[PDB]
Amino acid sequence: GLTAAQIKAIQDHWFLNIKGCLQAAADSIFFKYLTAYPGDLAFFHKFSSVPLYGLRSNPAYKAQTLTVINYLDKVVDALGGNAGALMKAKVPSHDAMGITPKHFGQLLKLVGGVFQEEFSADPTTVAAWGDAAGVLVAAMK
Amino acid sequence: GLTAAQIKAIQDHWFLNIKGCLQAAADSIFFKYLTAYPGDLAFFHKFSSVPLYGLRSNPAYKAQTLTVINYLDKVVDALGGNAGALMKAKVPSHDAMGITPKHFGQLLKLVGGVFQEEFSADPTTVAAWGDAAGVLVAAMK
Amino acid sequence: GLTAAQIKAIQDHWFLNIKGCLQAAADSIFFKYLTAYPGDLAFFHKFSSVPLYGLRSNPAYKAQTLTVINYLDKVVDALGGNAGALMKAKVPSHDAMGITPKHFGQLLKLVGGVFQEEFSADPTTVAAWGDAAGVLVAAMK
Amino acid sequence: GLTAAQIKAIQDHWFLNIKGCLQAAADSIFFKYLTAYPGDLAFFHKFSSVPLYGLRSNPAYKAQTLTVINYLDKVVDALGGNAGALMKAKVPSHDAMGITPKHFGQLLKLVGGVFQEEFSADPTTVAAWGDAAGVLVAAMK
Ligand code: HEM
Ligand code: HEM
Ligand code: HEM
Ligand code: HEM
Ligand SMILES: [C-]#N
Ligand SMILES: [C-]#N
Ligand SMILES: [C-]#N
Ligand SMILES: [C-]#N
């Protein structure tokens, strides 16, 4: 579930490690998702023919992951409150495309791990991200 | 003064070269400030004993710098809107420390320049940033 | 085994992705090793009491992994030739400390993977690094 | 002219702020050159049609720049040694293109400055780099 201490862990960690280099965190969050779900690369017509090893270098990828991280920044600042409404607002748009809350849960389940592996997240922050994913995907119904 | 073209010029560039690495842009805007105005380092009590050459590496410098650009990010979002009010909302606390609109002008004026030299900004965006400085300072009084 | 095409893959990939940001590659290569072998943190007296999540931010870690990557750069430039002699020269020094070719093989077995995960290494480069580890550890006897 | 103190000043700083991120130092040394001497961009045929503001992002710019700093890294290693000879070893191929020791002096002279503004170099190292420029240019003829 998500308590105010959890919201603090996630937010303190976001100012310290993530907010200052949003592009770096966005590229590794999605790179981890696409090596785990390679076929989902096909939803991104602007770069679905780039091989996996060329994505971090591809500007169409970089603009896309920065568009996502820029919206997640707004969700993290809103975790005490309308974060659930901000996840909600993107379901129509993605639904058009064939992308459900199952795909979103898959992306949100990986960021605790990517933040531990590369962005110096402590165990409390990683566990709080585990909880936040469950919370934020539930907000979409 | 600002036209919709100038606000698109600033916003597109900010998304392109600044948003993905807010810490670098922040470190260099304050480094060009603190180089040009070396005595005002005394105002920054949690790093006023670091010599200039040691600041980009100093953890408290980087916290300060990112707290400024994190706010500035939000006034860029709001340039055809309440950007003015967000700048003026910071004047009474800084006034209490001896830091006037003179000071803010000094900072705001260096930004175009810093973006041209290190963050890939064209002469149109450099121009828009020179005028954005004047608007924001004019809304502060 | 290691052929000249393999040496080309590793070297082309090192100029493209690694040489320009040696510090970033050095911190993730060892971070991956120390999350896999946490107890080996005890060999590094200058930072053995730092928790895992604080290493990427710790200057004593950064200086150490940059000392290692700076020597590996010299080994990669030497892969057609005296690379084996350059690995050889560090066995005495590490032997003093209790660190064998078993520990070195453990570090070299992970860099193909870290380069795929974070430094855009193609499958041919990753497989060539798999071979290079076997080769370079063998050079130490 | 160079004393052992000046060579330690340069080398320690290079290991500290330059070696871990050779690409940034390279991009900015050539960006300060190409800003001060904008016509010599015509010499760089694989990126001579990119306007100045687009160069830090240009892949061929970054390849060129890193090929220079990759070599320069090696002449720093050899400053109490064959640094001179390594600089002069590049004169006949560049002479063939119309690029003289005038040109190299222009580059070498900007380095201290660039390191002071963006790479945390103290006034002693800035001084050592001003003299290293003169020595290296004097060994070239
Ligand atoms: C995990 C949180 C995610 C958020 C907040 C998010 C947000 C966004 C945003 C802000 C856009 C731009 C369009 C708009 O403003 O509505 C976008 C587009 C898109 N995203 Fe999502 N995204 C998420 C998950 C996903 C997932 C999991 C996929 C695919 C597996 C996906 C696929 C796409 C695609 C294909 C586009 C359209 C890109 C284009 O061609 O322009 N996103 N995303
Ligand atoms: C557009 C420019 C600036 C903005 C948006 C800005 C914003 C901020 C913010 C967000 C804080 C934290 C507390 C608060 O919410 O007020 C702060 C604190 C402070 N700022 Fe400003 N600032 C600006 C300019 C300056 C300048 C030019 C100086 C000094 C000449 C300055 C001096 C200080 C001081 C001394 C503190 C440090 C408080 C502490 O010791 O932690 N700032 N700034
Ligand atoms: C994989 C290739 C490795 C290379 C080329 C390498 C190279 C180096 C270098 C150049 C030094 C500095 C001392 C000197 O010049 O001899 C060093 C020190 C050290 N390395 Fe290695 N290293 C490697 C593997 C390891 C491994 C696997 C460990 C530990 C599990 C290790 C432990 C140490 C320690 C503890 C020091 C001393 C640090 C100090 O307190 O100053 N290294 N390494
Ligand atoms: C200390 C300064 C410099 C060094 C060490 C250096 C080194 C190099 C190196 C390593 C190359 C690749 C080929 C070779 O091995 O010779 C090269 C090529 C080239 N350099 Fe220099 N360079 C320096 C200064 C300059 C300057 C100041 C200019 C022009 C005003 C310049 C113009 C060129 C040109 C045009 C090429 C491009 C070849 C191609 O089109 O790929 N360089 N440089
Ligand atoms: C979503 N991208
Ligand atoms: C304002 N700092
Ligand atoms: C070896 N460090
Ligand atoms: C020389 N480029």
Side-chain angles (χ1 to χ4, degrees), chain C residues 24-113:
Chain C
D27 299 337
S28 295
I29 287 171
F30 257 100
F31 196 80
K32 180 78 123 192
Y33 178 84
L34 289 162
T35 148
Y37 299 114
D40 294 3
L41 182 68
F43 296 111
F44 302 94
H45 302 110
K46 273 69 151 277
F47 51 91
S48 53
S49 66
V50 181
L52 282 202
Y53 51 97
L55 298 171
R56 295 203 183 247
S57 166
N58 187 285
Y61 177 79
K62 288 183 102 66
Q64 198 52 35
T65 54
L66 190 56
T67 288
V68 89
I69 203 66
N70 178 356
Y71 194 73
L72 281 172
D73 186 43
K74 289 161 177 170
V75 178
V76 161
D77 279 13
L79 284 183
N82 77 307
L86 280 182
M87 287 318 283
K88 193 88 164 185
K90 294 296 160 178
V91 179
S93 204
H94 287 77
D95 184 59
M97 284 168 236
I99 302 154
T100 57
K102 182 97 288 77
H103 306 76
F104 277 73
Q106 284 181 339
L107 195 287
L108 259 25
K109 219 283 192 74
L110 295 164
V111 350

Side-chain angles (χ1 to χ4, degrees), chain B residues 52-75:
Chain B
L52 294 172
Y53 57 86
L55 301 177
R56 291 182 181 271
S57 179
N58 187 278
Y61 177 78
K62 292 181 107 56
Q64 186 71 45
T65 239
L66 188 70
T67 310
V68 183
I69 199 86
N70 175 58
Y71 195 78
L72 218 49
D73 174 52
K74 293 177 210 285
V75 340

Side-chain angles (χ1 to χ4, degrees), chain B residues 13-62:
Chain B
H13 169 273
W14 194 267
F15 184 70
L16 240 68
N17 301 273
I18 306 316
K19 191 60 166 188
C21 49
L22 285 181
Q23 192 61 261
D27 293 348
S28 294
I29 286 164
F30 268 96
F31 206 82
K32 178 68 240 292
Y33 184 88
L34 244 30
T35 300
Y37 302 105
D40 296 7
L41 177 59
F43 291 120
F44 296 91
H45 303 172
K46 63 289 99 190
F47 53 81
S48 39
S49 296
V50 186
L52 294 172
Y53 57 86
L55 301 177
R56 291 182 181 271
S57 179
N58 187 278
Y61 177 78
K62 292 181 107 56

Side-chain angles (χ1 to χ4, degrees), chain D residues 25-84:
Chain D
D27 293 348
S28 294
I29 286 164
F30 268 96
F31 206 82
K32 178 68 240 292
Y33 184 88
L34 244 30
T35 300
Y37 302 105
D40 296 7
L41 177 59
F43 291 120
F44 296 91
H45 303 172
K46 63 289 99 190
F47 53 81
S48 39
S49 296
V50 186
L52 294 172
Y53 57 86
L55 301 177
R56 291 182 181 271
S57 179
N58 187 278
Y61 177 78
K62 292 181 107 56
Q64 186 71 45
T65 239
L66 188 70
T67 310
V68 183
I69 199 86
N70 175 58
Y71 195 78
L72 218 49
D73 174 52
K74 293 177 210 285
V75 340
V76 149
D77 287 22
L79 281 157
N82 63 329

Side-chain angles (χ1 to χ4, degrees), chain A:
Chain A
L2 208 74
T3 187
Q6 274 169 322
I7 292 172
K8 220 214 180 302
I10 294 170
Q11 287 179 309
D12 280 336
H13 182 259
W14 195 271
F15 193 82
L16 236 297
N17 292 97
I18 306 303
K19 183 68 167 235
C21 61
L22 282 165
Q23 191 64 79
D27 299 337
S28 295
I29 287 171
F30 257 100
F31 196 80
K32 180 78 123 192
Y33 178 84
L34 289 162
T35 148
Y37 299 114
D40 294 3
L41 182 68
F43 296 111
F44 302 94
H45 302 110
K46 273 69 151 277
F47 51 91
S48 53
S49 66
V50 181
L52 282 202
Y53 51 97
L55 298 171
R56 295 203 183 247
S57 166
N58 187 285
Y61 177 79
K62 288 183 102 66
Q64 198 52 35
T65 54
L66 190 56
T67 288
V68 89
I69 203 66
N70 178 356
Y71 194 73
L72 281 172
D73 186 43
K74 289 161 177 170
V75 178
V76 161
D77 279 13
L79 284 183
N82 77 307
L86 280 182
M87 287 318 283
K88 193 88 164 185
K90 294 296 160 178
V91 179
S93 204
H94 287 77
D95 184 59
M97 284 168 236
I99 302 154
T100 57
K102 182 97 288 77
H103 306 76
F104 277 73
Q106 284 181 339
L107 195 287
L108 259 25
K109 219 283 192 74
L110 295 164
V111 350
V114 171
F115 288 177
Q116 183 172 68
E117 293 167 26
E118 302 169 52
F119 294 100
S120 312
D122 102 278
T124 302
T125 295
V126 177
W129 255 112
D131 275 293
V135 174
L136 293 176
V137 171
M140 292 202 264
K141 15 285 212 175

